[PDB]
Design an enzyme around this catalytic site. Structure first.
Site, short mmCIF file in Angstrom:
data_model
loop_
_atom_site.label_atom_id
_atom_site.label_comp_id
_atom_site.label_asym_id
_atom_site.label_seq_id
_atom_site.Cartn_x
_atom_site.Cartn_y
_atom_site.Cartn_z
N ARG A 1 0.81 -1.29 -0.30
CA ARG A 1 -0.02 0.26 -0.12
C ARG A 1 0.98 1.33 0.11
NH1 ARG A 1 -5.29 1.03 2.74
NH2 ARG A 1 -6.21 0.33 1.01
N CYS B 1 -13.72 4.39 9.07
CA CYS B 1 -14.71 4.44 7.99
C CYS B 1 -15.65 3.37 8.24
CB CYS B 1 -13.91 4.39 6.36
SG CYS B 1 -13.02 3.22 6.20
C1 SAM Z 1 -7.90 3.21 6.33
S1 SAM Z 1 -6.43 2.85 5.79
C2 SAM Z 1 -5.53 4.43 5.82
C3 SAM Z 1 -6.13 5.39 4.87
C4 SAM Z 1 -5.20 6.50 4.45
N1 SAM Z 1 -5.18 7.28 5.56
C5 SAM Z 1 -5.87 7.44 3.41
O1 SAM Z 1 -6.83 8.11 3.72
O2 SAM Z 1 -5.61 6.87 2.22
C6 SAM Z 1 -5.82 2.07 7.16
C7 SAM Z 1 -4.47 1.57 7.00
O3 SAM Z 1 -3.83 1.12 8.27
C8 SAM Z 1 -2.73 0.27 7.93
N2 SAM Z 1 -2.17 -0.74 9.20
C9 SAM Z 1 -2.67 -2.03 9.74
N3 SAM Z 1 -1.84 -2.20 10.65
C10 SAM Z 1 -1.06 -1.37 10.94
C11 SAM Z 1 -0.10 -1.11 11.82
N4 SAM Z 1 0.16 -1.80 12.86
N5 SAM Z 1 0.57 -0.01 11.67
C12 SAM Z 1 0.41 0.90 10.72
N6 SAM Z 1 -0.37 0.73 9.59
C13 SAM Z 1 -1.21 -0.11 9.79
C14 SAM Z 1 -3.32 -0.53 6.67
O4 SAM Z 1 -2.38 -1.18 5.80
C15 SAM Z 1 -4.11 0.58 6.12
O5 SAM Z 1 -3.52 1.18 4.74
#
Ligand code: SAM
Ligand code: SAM
Ligand code: SAM
Ligand code: SAM
Lengths: 57, 333, 338, 338, 338
Positions: free
Chosen positions: E163, E264
């Site tokens: 990502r 979300c």
């Molecule tokens: C809702 S998305 C963020 C969307 C972003 N802020 C945007 O507006 O485009 C949540 C994110 O948390 C990440 N994630 C999951 N576990 C995580 C962790 N332990 N530390 C950091 N990021 C993590 C996922 O890979 C995902 O991209």
């Protein structure tokens, strides 16, 4: 009272202390009015308390 | 070090709270404190009173009561001698009288004010939730108003000191049987056990004991290891005050008190406990005005009159009576 | 060396500008400066005022306001209010003792060049104004802007995060936590020149107390001296920066709002040339009209305390004199019209 | 609901105060109100006056001044001048048409409760006065204060910046750009209670037309109704605010200056007890003596147009009646002595 | 199947939460969503803004800011600036055409759920802030944080390196090389929960847009669906992770700094429970006090564009409605005090 800080280690204080002449040379009334900023009656009691502190040990 | 951390913390906090009044307090906290001789009514008080008058001491309570209309409430039969304003004389140590009980108890004269302000009436069921070592417990007994007196304290070691004072000052006829009850348990649990039971409740909570914290290095609350314990202290205090209020009968009265100048441990705890009871238990608690009480006792003590809830005795060299915060309340519902 | 280069540069420039007045200024810059005690209104100003009167000091701001009627509008409508600043009499060289904490654990007064209060006074804060101090550190004028009790909001900015620490130290020392943690004060550390883009047409009053050759300070301190050989380019491009900051201040001012530009330098290239240069830049590049406001009544009223170089075309200039050794202080009030 | 709570509260409180007079007031509050056309002196008042006379309307302020001699000093020395306000005869319910711009662009007249002019009239503006309208928005009384041609300076203040927009709209509509943008008028948006500190002992005349329970408006509009269940605390602490604002107005008044306090409520709690309260607060806390001035001659002269509740101890009160449906209007003139 | 399990789970959970409001939300989640065009300030926003106005679209961030005064501090002080996001009118279902590279080879605008801009706006970036986006990928909110022109430094972190490639693609497509290849933007791919240890008490502003059940996406995409039978444990332990990430964000925040937590999802277990849980965890384990800041004025100003579930105890929630189909967007602003 917190109006005299002991300088250390570089001979510096947070706030500069009053001048030695404004502490000792000046009258008891002026010392209390300008430097210590307390009543006369309060310092009379302080003198008695300190006298007793010295008398013991 | 802990003594210096205590003073360091006070300089930060109390220079802000008192402003230009803080130096007069600071010098008083760092000098010898003034004591009052609480006369023991079980040891023939008339002779002790006469003996204490020979020293030029005067019962400040007798002076206070003589003076405003008698609208204000005040716990009776408390005789406490102090020297005049500006006098630094010390009372000699008390000795056992003719009935084998001590003549008087030396203490901070201000410590009697929460007991006086609580306004004990004859036949009251009384609770001292944080009773040890027993100075205020002793005064509560001296009134001769306690039908029953519950003295509680979490520490069993400080309860030993309370038992020592009771054995030293109170005759066995009055200690036993059902008039006094000494327990050692968490005061915060009094809402569940013994709810709506007491007419009068004293909640003299554990605090940062400002004056003591500048003298004693052992068991100092300002030590680096006791950082969490000191920061969560206003939580405990609200928990204990709320428990005191829950053990009070509806219509009953409570006095909350500390020996701290901190607003965080004083007013904010009264304000906090009243909210907690209104929201969680739907109990209404009214802070009672002690302005008449203050004004009458202003001849002996220095009060910080800018107090929103409750009253505060601030130490001054003319009357070096340590920090003593106190607030009277009435439980309505 | 840098101290000697500064004096060498001032002998060349200021002997030409001031002429036969330059020696009286030169001796004053090379002697001890006079300070004023700005009373802290959060620290129970009535007792502090009374205590400062015992020293034979007098509030020059009050003396000035009293004669505002003599020789249009109340002093409060023209001149920022509630500023009490004590100075000793003309010719007196007495020093104020260091201030101590008082009424709310806040320092009783702030010692400073009394002239540094004039740009703040001249800015004419009214109740409820949104105010910006674009080059605020170490916070002397920021402190005065707060003392008025007129700031709905006060933005204090400075590019240097090290000087902002000193500004935070003053705010913690002088202002109670109730005000300095709320939405009333905002301390930022960013390039002031970028305020045209971020926060344009926002502020009612804007102070642009720009970085300059700090004439008096440059003759005392050798460390971080602008007249050092390595800082030759930085010093020569200084009037560019000063126009860029003043123009940014004007762009962040609401149409109809007012701006005070100020320096602590005697140089016309940093003073009148920057005011004219920023007014031209906004009229050509942005088509914004800026009017210089006349401070002759303001000057005339404050002449009793300070020495002014009355031959100023735009703005006003306080020149140091041994009778009133208040350091170089240039200031010009403007109104953004369009 | 809030409209019914307002009426419910007035039935309880005002049936006790007015007694057998309450029904005549109650029916008037629940019926269409009578308006007066305040002529705009900037828009050639002689033609507007002549135009308004064609409708059978008459200037009640002129009618009043004519009888000032009947039953000490000229009307101009006691009563604010050059205010021309037309109303229809007693018992007539005719409505004035909406005002229109004249040859000069400004609007001919301002429709309002005729009684709202009485606090401005009673304040007694003299030529050259420094005037303050502490609770000025939306600007009806501000407009009248300007119409006198006596204000050297006029400060218009209101805490709400949204209602200040309406005040600015009225100033732009009725006042020429020459006056409204100069040093003659100053519009601020700030807490009026803080005027004791900022701008103390400054004004000759001060109007404190405080926020109240707006009795008539609270029976018509459901939105932003003070009798809403959520606004119970705000409504109960309203006499505290009202004393705080009146005391601030008095502290802003020069010694010897005059203040008019006013409300559009019938409650004794928001009227006489606010006047008595503020006078006590200044006598105890600040050691300032304030004298209530008698408006009996003023009342008696204006009784021909309005219904007054003559049993008023302190100040005067216009009560609404179907013959002259001029809404609740309480007002009290005071003189600051020390 | 996973799409049906998602809807099945939402019917059970959300019918209880929203009650009679759930159908209007359900139909909106199962219909086409509404997008906003976030203008790229690096690609000459004035021409893009003008181009987007031709479609009958309007900038809602500007419409909102205009009414910031109506119903304390300037909008720029409270709400992150320079964000221009165009949406079609309420009830309009028009689609924006795809973004094309413009003048400097950068994309003109970024299409997104308009509600996704609210946590960034609510975070209230001020000039010169050190900012952290703890869960930044694919970079929609990261992009908006950059657009403000307030970030001294911007840390963008995400555990997934796949990502992060999409985040790098967006940064390369929208941000010129001068900024992305500098000390202003730092992209990392480490565990966000470990930020308490590495980089504690560092950031002024922190965005914690956590991984959640992505309610709308989980009803469209069958691949990588959180509601799959194999991902039962991962989905149930999701509020643990969410608290761990929010607590880490708070530990990285300077004392006095602010944090916005967002999801979300409509689930209270992932929204308010996580906010209280993280505040409790910091108070007990680290003795750090965290205050939830009220976003009622922020909500009220943005209510004209979005449907909010006003019964929210902590934080705010945008619920999807056919009139404004902006997906579930929970957000809560906090201030770290100690
Ligand atoms: C809702 S998305 C963020 C969307 C972003 N802020 C945007 O507006 O485009 C949540 C994110 O948390 C990440 N994630 C999951 N576990 C995580 C962790 N332990 N530390 C950091 N990021 C993590 C996922 O890979 C995902 O991209
Ligand atoms: C200030 S002392 C009481 C002084 C006493 N009333 C006197 O006048 O001699 C506060 C007391 O609270 C006690 N305490 C602490 N935590 C407690 C708890 N949870 N319940 C009851 N007592 C507690 C301490 O052991 C301490 O003795
Ligand atoms: C004369 S000092 C301001 C003095 C201050 N107003 C006072 O009275 O204490 C000028 C300031 O401009 C600052 N500065 C320099 N370049 C700047 C820039 N581009 N934007 C903002 N501030 C800048 C310097 O760090 C310096 O503190
Ligand atoms: C009755 S209105 C004034 C009517 C105005 N003088 C007129 O005739 O058009 C009362 C005003 O008080 C204002 N207000 C409320 N609290 C205030 C405060 N603390 N300071 C100043 N104005 C305040 C309200 O916004 C409101 O406009």
């Amino acid at each position: 009272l917190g109006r005299y800080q002991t300088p250390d280690k570089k001979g510096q204080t947070q706030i500069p202390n009053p001048l030695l002449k404004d502490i000792l040379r000046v009258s008891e009334a002026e010392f209390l009015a300008r430097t210590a900023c307390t009543s006369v009656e309060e310092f009379q009691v302080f003198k008695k308390l300190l006298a007793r502190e010295e008398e013991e040990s | 070090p802990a003594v210096r951390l205590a003073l360091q913390n006070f300089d930060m906090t109390y220079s802000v709270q008192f402003g230009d009044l803080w130096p007069s307090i600071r010098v008083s906290l760092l000098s010898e404190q003034k004591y009052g001789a609480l006369v023991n009514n079980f040891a023939a008080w008339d002779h002790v009173s006469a003996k204490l008058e020979q020293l030029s001491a005067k019962d400040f309570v007798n002076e206070a009561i003589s003076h405003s209309p008698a609208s204000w409430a005040c716990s009776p039969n408390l005789r406490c001698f102090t020297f005049d304003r500006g006098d630094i004389s010390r009372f000699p140590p008390a000795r056992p009288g003719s009935l084998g009980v001590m003549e008087y108890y030396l203490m901070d004269a201000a410590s009697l004010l929460p007991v006086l302000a609580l306004g004990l009436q004859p036949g009251d069921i009384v609770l001292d939730l944080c009773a040890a070592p027993g100075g205020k417990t002793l005064a509560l007994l001296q009134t001769g108003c306690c039908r029953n007196l519950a003295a509680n304290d979490l520490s069993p070691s400080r309860i030993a000191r309370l038992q020592k004072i009771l054995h030293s000052y109170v005759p066995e006829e009055i200690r036993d049987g059902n008039q006094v009850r000494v327990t050692s348990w968490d005061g915060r649990k009094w809402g569940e056990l013994e709810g709506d039971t007491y007419d009068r409740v004293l909640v003299d909570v554990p605090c940062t004991t400002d004056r003591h914290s500048l003298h004693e290095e052992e068991n100092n609350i300002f030590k680096r290891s006791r950082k969490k314990e000191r920061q969560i202290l206003p939580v405990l205090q609200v928990q204990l005050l709320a428990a005191g209020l829950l053990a009070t009968k509806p219509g009953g009265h409570v006095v909350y008190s500390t020996c701290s100048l901190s607003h965080l441990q004083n007013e904010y705890v009264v304000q906090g406990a009243i909210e907690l009871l209104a929201n969680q238990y739907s109990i209404q608690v009214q802070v009672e005005d002690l302005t008449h009480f203050r004004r009458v006792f202003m001849d002996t003590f220095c009060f910080f009159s800018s107090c929103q809830v409750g009253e505060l005795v601030i130490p001054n060299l003319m009357a070096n009576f340590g920090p003593m915060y106190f607030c009277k309340m009435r439980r309505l519902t």
